[PDB]
Amino acid sequence: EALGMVETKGLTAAIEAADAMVASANVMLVGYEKIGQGLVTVIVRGDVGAVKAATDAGAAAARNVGEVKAVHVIPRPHTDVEKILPKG
Amino acid sequence: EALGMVETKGLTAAIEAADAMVASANVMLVGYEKIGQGLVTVIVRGDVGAVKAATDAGAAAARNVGEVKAVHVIPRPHTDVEKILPK
Amino acid sequence: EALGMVETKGLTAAIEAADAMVASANVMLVGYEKIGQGLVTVIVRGDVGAVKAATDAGAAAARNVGEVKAVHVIPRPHTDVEKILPK
Amino acid sequence: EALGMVETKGLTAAIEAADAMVASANVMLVGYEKIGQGLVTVIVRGDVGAVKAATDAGAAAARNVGEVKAVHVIPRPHTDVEKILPKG
Amino acid sequence: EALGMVETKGLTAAIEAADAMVASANVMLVGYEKIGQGLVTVIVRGDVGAVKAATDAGAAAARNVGEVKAVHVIPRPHTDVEKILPK
Amino acid sequence: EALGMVETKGLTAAIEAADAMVASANVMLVGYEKIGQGLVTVIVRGDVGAVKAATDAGAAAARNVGEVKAVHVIPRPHTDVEKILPK
């Protein structure tokens, strides 16, 4: 039901965050978003609780590799969940 | 139609602003714009009051995630929404 | 016809400058140009006086919304407006 | 015969450089190149002497509006002049 | 199969890391990823030991050419290599 | 085939490096690569000696225009020139 995000400065940290997120909780990786200036956002989906767990492990994983710029969990409607996400 | 903008440093704060703005039934998400230096702009369209309330809710939500760089509402855009916005 | 430019750091300020420019005078909005590092240029065309008045109005407006990096008017451009501007 | 370049931080300064270059000497504007981080390169073509004159006025024009990052004149072969230029 | 990454500040360092990685071990170059601010990531795949040896060799090499920002090996990735990586 | 690279801060220095490298008949310009933070990489292909001489001439010329960030020659690239380079 919720959306989880880990924004890092560096792709290596983002890949590590992504891997940790999916390994730790029952979340599905939505994808990556590059906005420039080394900023990469990793987006995940699933239960709010599992998203909170995932985002936490992903934030930790990336801090061990590089710089974490933002960490957020967005509870979302079951009707139009991935609606709010960008189209690049 | 009113134009509402919330500009943030980071995409995570932009997605958070967009979620807060889209929360009301009369506010429609136009899109995101990446301009560099980590800056992302969220643009919404709707009734003046709805847009004002939305952008305020956007900025409030965005602040807690990352840096809000700008918050603005153009109640009566002059050319047309499509013409006044970038491609 | 003259060329008017308002360059801002942030898109929100640029949309506001654009709106003020077309509202102020009989100027035609050519478009926006993103060059990176949050820099957005709003370009307008018309009579020198209209262009001068418009750029002034767009700069003043954007200034209450964000950072204005440059404000410039080219009264008599060289290779006809289309040629002098980027694709 | 030569290639002239004025690289500015800001598009407003680049448009001003471009306008000054074509107004001052017998040069032809090739175009603009955006490389990010506010960096814009204005490229001109013609006689080496006219290119030197153009680049000088363009550098001055842009310094009056914004930041000039680089100014260079490249004498080139008449066979393949614009060959060396980027394809974006 | 394991995932190996060498992130550098500069493309020249990245090409050098890539070359050293494929020369050192039985690793397959997946590709390069540009994320802005001069950051380039070189990604390889193969046996954990081969990947460890390769990343080490690519980091050492790039270091004599430019700035290495990160060096990381994921021994057992989750959503099969293609899914875990960006498009 | 040998691979030669000259990485600079600014495009003007990159065009200058490319002109100096392309000056010899056995050095072929592969292209330019923009990676962000004002960084531009010029890549050339040819005989080892020609590539070495070219990159050195590139760097020398580039220095006088802007900042040279990296200069490197890979005499014997391992995969293949097309495979070892970004898309």
Swiss-Prot record, chains B, C, E, F:
GO biological process, one term: propanediol catabolic process
Biological pathway: Polyol metabolism; 1,2-propanediol degradation
Keyword Ion transport belongs to the record: no
One cellular component term from this protein's GO annotations in UniProt: propanediol degradation polyhedral organelle
Gene ablation phenotype (knockout): Cells do not make BMCs, diol dehydratase is found in diffuse aggregates near the cell pole; it was later found this a double pduA-pduBB' deletion. A single deletion forms larger than normal BMCs; it is not fully complemented by protein produced from a plasmid. Grows in an interrupted manner on 1,2-PD and vitamin B12; grows for a while then stops, then restarts as toxic propionaldehyde accumulates and then decreases. Increased DNA mutagenesis, showing propionaldehyde is a mutagen.
Induction description: The first gene in the pdu operon. BMC production is induced by growth on 1,2-PD vitamin B12 medium. No change when grown in the presence of 1,2-PD, ethanolamine and vitamin B12, suggesting it is possible for both the eut and pdu operons to be expressed at the same time.
Effect after changing K34A: Slow growth at limiting vitamin B12, wild-type at saturating conditions
UniProt entry keywords in alphabetical sequence: Bacterial microcompartment, Transport
Reported impact of K34Q: Improved growth on 1,2-PD, makes slightly larger BMCs, alters accumulation of PD metabolites
Ranges of residues in domain BMC: 2-86
Location in or out of the cell: Bacterial microcompartment
Biotechnology and industry use: Artificial BMCs can be made in E.coli by expressing pduA-pduB/B'-pduT-pduU-pduN-pduJ-pduK (in this order). Enzymes can be targeted to the BMC, and appear to be encapsulated within it.
One Pfam family per UniProt: BMC
Effect on the protein of changing V81A: Decreased amounts of PduP in purified BMCs
Other notes: Bacterial microcompartments (BMC) 100-200 nm in cross section are formed during aerobic growth on minimal 1,2-PD-B12 or anaerobic growth on 1,2-PD-tetrathionate medium, but not during aerobic growth on glucose, anerobic growth on glucose or pyruvate-tetrathionate. BMCs can constitute up to 10% of total cell protein.
Free-text comment on this protein's domains from its UniProt entry: The C-terminal 14 residues mediate binding to the N-terminus of PduP, which encapsulates PduP into BMCs.
Role played: One of the major shell proteins of the bacterial microcompartment (BMC) dedicated to 1,2-propanediol (1,2-PD) degradation. At least one of PduA or PduJ is required for BMC assembly; it must be encoded as the first gene in the pdu operon. Not required for structural integrity of BMCs, it is required to mitigate propionaldehyde toxicity. Controls diffusion of 1,2-PD into and propionaldehyde out of the BMC shell; residue 40 is particularly important for pore permeability. The 1,2-PD-specific bacterial microcompartment (BMC) concentrates low levels of 1,2-PD catabolic enzymes, concentrates volatile reaction intermediates thus enhancing pathway flux and keeps the level of toxic, mutagenic propionaldehyde low.
Assembly description: Homohexamer with a central pore of about 5.6 Angstroms in diameter. The hexamers pack against each other in arrays. Interacts with the N-terminus of PduP which targets PduP to the BMC. Modeling suggests PduC, PduD, PduE, PduL and PduP interact with a cleft formed by the C-terminal segments of 2 adjacent PduA subunits (on the BMC luminal side) in the hexamer.
Family: Belongs to the bacterial microcompartments protein family.
The protein, known as: Bacterial microcompartment shell protein PduA
Source species: Salmonella typhimurium (strain LT2 / SGSC1412 / ATCC 700720)
Gene: pduA
